[PDB]
Amino acid sequence: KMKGLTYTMCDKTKFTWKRIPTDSGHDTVVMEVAFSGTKPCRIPVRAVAHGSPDVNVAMLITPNPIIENNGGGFIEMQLPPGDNIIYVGELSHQWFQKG
Amino acid sequence: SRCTHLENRDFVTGTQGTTRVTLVLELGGCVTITAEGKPSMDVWLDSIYQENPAKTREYCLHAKLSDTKVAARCPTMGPATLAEEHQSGTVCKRDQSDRGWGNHCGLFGKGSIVTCVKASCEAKKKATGHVYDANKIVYTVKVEPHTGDYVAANETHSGRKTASFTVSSEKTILTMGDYGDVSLLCRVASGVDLAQTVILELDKTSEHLPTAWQVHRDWFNDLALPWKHEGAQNWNNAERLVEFGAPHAVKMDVYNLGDHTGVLLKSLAGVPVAHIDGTKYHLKSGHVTCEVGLEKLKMKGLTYTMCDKTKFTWKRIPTDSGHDTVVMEVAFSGTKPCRIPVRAVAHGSPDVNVAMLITPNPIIENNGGGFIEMQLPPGDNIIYVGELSHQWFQKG
Numbered sequence: 342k343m344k345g346l347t348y349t350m351c352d353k354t355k356f357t358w359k360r361i362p363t364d365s366g367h368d369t370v371v372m373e374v375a376f377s378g379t380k381p382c383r384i385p386v387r388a389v390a391h392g393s394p395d396v397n398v399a400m401l402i403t404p405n406p407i408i409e410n411n412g413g414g415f416i417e418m419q420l421p422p423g424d425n426i427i428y429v430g431e432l433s434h435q436w437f438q439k440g
Numbered sequence: 441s442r443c444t445h446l447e448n449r450d451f452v453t454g455t456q457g458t459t460r461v462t463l464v465l466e467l468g469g470c471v472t473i474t475a476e477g478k479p480s481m482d483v484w485l486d487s488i489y490q491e492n493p494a495k496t497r498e499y500c501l502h503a504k505l506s507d508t509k510v511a512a513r514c515p516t517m518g519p520a521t522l523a524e525e526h527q528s529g530t531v532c533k534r535d536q537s538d539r540g541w542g543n544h545c546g547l548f549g550k551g552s553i554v555t556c557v558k559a560s561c562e563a564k565k566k567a568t569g570h571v572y573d574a575n576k577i578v579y580t581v582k583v584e585p586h587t588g589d590y591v592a593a594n595e596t597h598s599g600r601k602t603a604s605f606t607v608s609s610e611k612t613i614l615t616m617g618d619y620g621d622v623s624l625l626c627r628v629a630s631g632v633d634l635a636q637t638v639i640l641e642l643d644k645t646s647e648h649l650p651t652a653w654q655v656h657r658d659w660f661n662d663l664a665l666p667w668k669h670e671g672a673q674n675w676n677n678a679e680r681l682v683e684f685g686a687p688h689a690v691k692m693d694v695y696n697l698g699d700h701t702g703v704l705l706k707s708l709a710g711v712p713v714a715h716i717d718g719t720k721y722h723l724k725s726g727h728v729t730c731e732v733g734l735e736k737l738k739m740k741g742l743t744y745t746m747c748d749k750t751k752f753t754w755k756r757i758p759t760d761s762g763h764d765t766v767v768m769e770v771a772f773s774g775t776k777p778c779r780i781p782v783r784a785v786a787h788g789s790p791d792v793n794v795a796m797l798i799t800p801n802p803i804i805e806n807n808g809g810g811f812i813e814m815q816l817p818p819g820d821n822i823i824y825v826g827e828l829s830h831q832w833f834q835k836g
């Protein structure tokens with residue numbers, strides 16, 4: 342079963358990193374975010390090929406990423422080569438993908 | 441939407457200037473009707489039935505054989521005879537038996553022999569036929585407004601309306617609550633061939649059989665068994681379940697040809713069933729032709745506030761219905777009646793909304809309204825319900 346598909350989307354303003362986007366060595370990117378609302382909610386995660394904001398290119402490895410009353414901040418994803426911007430609502434981080 | 445409960449469906453589409461749509465409605469089909477600026481409607485033929493259709497010919501499946509009586513005569517004395525030959529409810533055969541001296545008979549030759557067996561039907565071994573009357577058959581047509589309410593097949597939509605079409609039923613108007621009126625005229629002769637049709641019925645209490653079968657009139661009259669009409673006392677053609685074994689002196693051998701139920705059931709394999717709800721005999725296949733009047737339907741809540749785009753969640757995530765439509769249901773968390781802000785985008789082209797809704801002007805009410813059905817172009821799309829979104833891939 343998919344957990345929390347009926348949860349509220351999180352407030353896009355209320356994110357911070359705990360751990361900035363990082364290459365895992367498996368072509369995936371890993372990260373962790375904190376969220377500051379007192380809530381269980383669905384994380385608004387996406388990524389953009391730089392200069393093309395319309396097409397979301399985030400292939401998540403963590404499907405339907407969710408923050409819970411304890412736990413949930415960690416996200417893993419895969420991205421196309423070249424410049425990308427990762428977003429977690431209003432958080433963003435320019436990511437360059439190798440090869 | 442009743443027509444999501446079925447894997448047979450049709451979609452009918454009128455322009456803004458449409459009135460009186462003409463349909464064929466079939467049992468186990470369902471039609472969704474759409475018109476620009478009108479609420480969409482699910483319309484279906486619910487049932488075709490009659491209370492107590494006229495019993496025709498009964499058939500007997502298994503004979504109960506009794507009172508085998510024999511009489512025989514010596515070769516000069518002409519015909520042997522029994523009173524049985526003239527009684528009701530007997531089967532008889534007349535034949536020639538070899539006779540001679542010691543066959544306790546004067547002369548060597550062939551003597552007349554007659555045998556008669558009393559032949560009733562075995563208890564509950566009847567196949568009764570029934571015939572429909574165009575002056576007493578009821579077609580039932582059902583309608584529901586294609587609202588944002590999802591209700592399962594074991595549950596009933598509160599906006600569901602029913603029209604009976606007897607031959608004595610003219611153009612009938614159903615008030616779809618807040619959605620205005622729909623009118624129906626279904627012509628009961630523009631339907632099933634009731635002269636060609638018999639409801640064949642065996643033992644109703646048979647736990648491992650159909651209640652009845654819908655069978656052709658000529659084929660039913662060609663069943664090769666003993667038969668009688670309602671209230672008649674004795675079987676015509678009782679011969680059909682009795683064999684006589686070749687004569688031996690003063691014997692001819694009466695043999696009961698056994699229960700023919702399995703012979704019938706093999707000839708009824710795959711044949712359309714008919715249900716029997718006590719006195720009501722229902723067809724399970726067949727159709728009617730209707731005109732549906734859309735011209736007095738109203739759009740509900742076009743003057744409601746658009747909903748707060750932030751306050752949505754899924755109850756049920758976007759899903760393929762199998763009809764090329766996508767279905768979903770959303771909750772909304774404002775304490776309100778409001779118009780749902782629904783749209784969809786071809787992925788990478790955010791400007792053109794591609795959501796062809798099947799639920800026009802989708803609305804959330806103080807109870808009900810969250811369900812949405814729509815159609816989308818092939819390839820990648822994003823569905824939105826305000827700030828909710830879901831990437832949808834459309835097949836073919």
Ligand SMILES: *[C@@H]1O[C@H](CO)[C@@H](O)[C@H](O)[C@H]1NC(C)=O
Nearest residue numbers: 590591592593594595596597
């Ligand atoms: C329909 O079936 C479901 C599943 O068994 C059940 O939860 C529900 O109460 C049923 N509805 C009605 C009205 O029978």
